[PDB]
Amino acid sequence: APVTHIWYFKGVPSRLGYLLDLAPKDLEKVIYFAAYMITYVDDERRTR
DNA sequence: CCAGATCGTGCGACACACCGGGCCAATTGGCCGATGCCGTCCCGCGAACCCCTCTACCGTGTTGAGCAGCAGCGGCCT
């Protein structure tokens, strides 16, 4: 299974957080299997 | 003065100088040929060597200092 690099996750400032605009707590929750993340949504289909 | 050392000279011996002959001793050193023991290998069996599998009373919780970013809150502004 894929894993993350600790240098680009933990070190302040959280580079992943800055790039994706995620607070470090949310990122830590996601990567360490504590909450889901929505990675795709079909806006036009649901609106129709 | 004059007689032996030194040297001249002479006669002989002569130890080889030659450069050429004519045979030989010692001493071979090869493996010739024949005989014999060891290295390698191909099984043969067996001791051990490692891996996998299953057992059903039941049983249910682990210092100080320096610098920077984030969360909560007081208080405008709409």
Coordinates of all heavy atoms in Angstrom, one line a residue, chain A residues 12 18 25, chain B residues 69-71:
Chain A
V12 N 7.3 21.4 10.1 CA 6.6 22.7 10.1 C 7.3 23.6 9.1 O 8.6 23.8 9.3 CB 6.5 23.3 11.5 CG1 5.9 24.7 11.4 CG2 5.6 22.4 12.4
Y18 N 0.1 22.9 3.0 CA 0.1 24.1 2.2 C -0.3 23.9 0.8 O -1.0 24.7 0.2 CB 1.5 24.7 2.3 CG 1.8 25.6 3.5 CD1 0.9 25.8 4.5 CD2 3.0 26.3 3.6 CE1 1.1 26.7 5.6 CE2 3.3 27.2 4.6 CZ 2.3 27.3 5.6 OH 2.6 28.2 6.7
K25 N -4.0 18.9 11.3 CA -4.8 17.9 12.0 C -5.7 17.0 11.1 O -5.7 15.8 11.3 CB -5.7 18.6 13.1 CG -6.8 19.5 12.5 CD -7.5 20.2 13.6 CE -8.8 20.8 13.1 NZ -8.5 21.9 12.1
Chain B
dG69 P 5.9 31.5 10.9 OP1 6.1 31.2 9.4 OP2 5.6 32.9 11.3 O5' 4.7 30.5 11.4 C5' 4.8 29.1 11.2 C4' 3.7 28.4 12.0 O4' 3.9 28.7 13.4 C3' 2.3 28.8 11.6 O3' 1.5 27.7 11.4 C2' 1.9 29.7 12.8 C1' 2.6 29.1 13.9 N9 2.9 30.0 15.0 C8 3.6 31.2 15.0 N7 3.6 31.8 16.1 C5 3.0 31.0 17.0 C6 2.7 31.1 18.4 O6 3.0 32.0 19.1 N1 2.0 30.0 18.9 C2 1.5 29.0 18.1 N2 0.9 28.0 18.8 N3 1.8 28.8 16.8 C4 2.5 29.9 16.3
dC70 P 0.0 27.9 10.9 OP1 -0.2 26.8 9.8 OP2 -0.2 29.3 10.5 O5' -0.9 27.5 12.1 C5' -0.7 26.3 12.8 C4' -1.6 26.2 14.0 O4' -1.1 27.1 15.1 C3' -3.1 26.6 13.8 O3' -4.0 25.7 14.5 C2' -3.2 28.0 14.4 C1' -2.2 27.9 15.5 N1 -1.6 29.3 15.9 C2 -1.7 29.7 17.3 O2 -2.2 29.0 18.1 N3 -1.1 30.9 17.6 C4 -0.5 31.6 16.7 N4 0.0 32.8 17.0 C5 -0.4 31.2 15.3 C6 -0.9 30.0 15.0
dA71 P -5.6 25.8 14.3 OP1 -6.1 24.5 13.9 OP2 -5.8 27.0 13.4 O5' -6.1 26.2 15.7 C5' -5.8 25.4 16.8 C4' -6.4 26.0 18.1 O4' -5.7 27.2 18.5 C3' -7.9 26.3 18.0 O3' -8.6 26.0 19.2 C2' -7.8 27.9 17.7 C1' -6.6 28.3 18.5 N9 -5.9 29.4 17.9 C8 -5.5 29.6 16.6 N7 -4.9 30.7 16.3 C5 -4.8 31.3 17.6 C6 -4.3 32.5 18.0 N6 -3.6 33.4 17.1 N1 -4.4 32.9 19.3 C2 -5.0 32.0 20.1 N3 -5.6 30.8 19.8 C4 -5.4 30.5 18.5

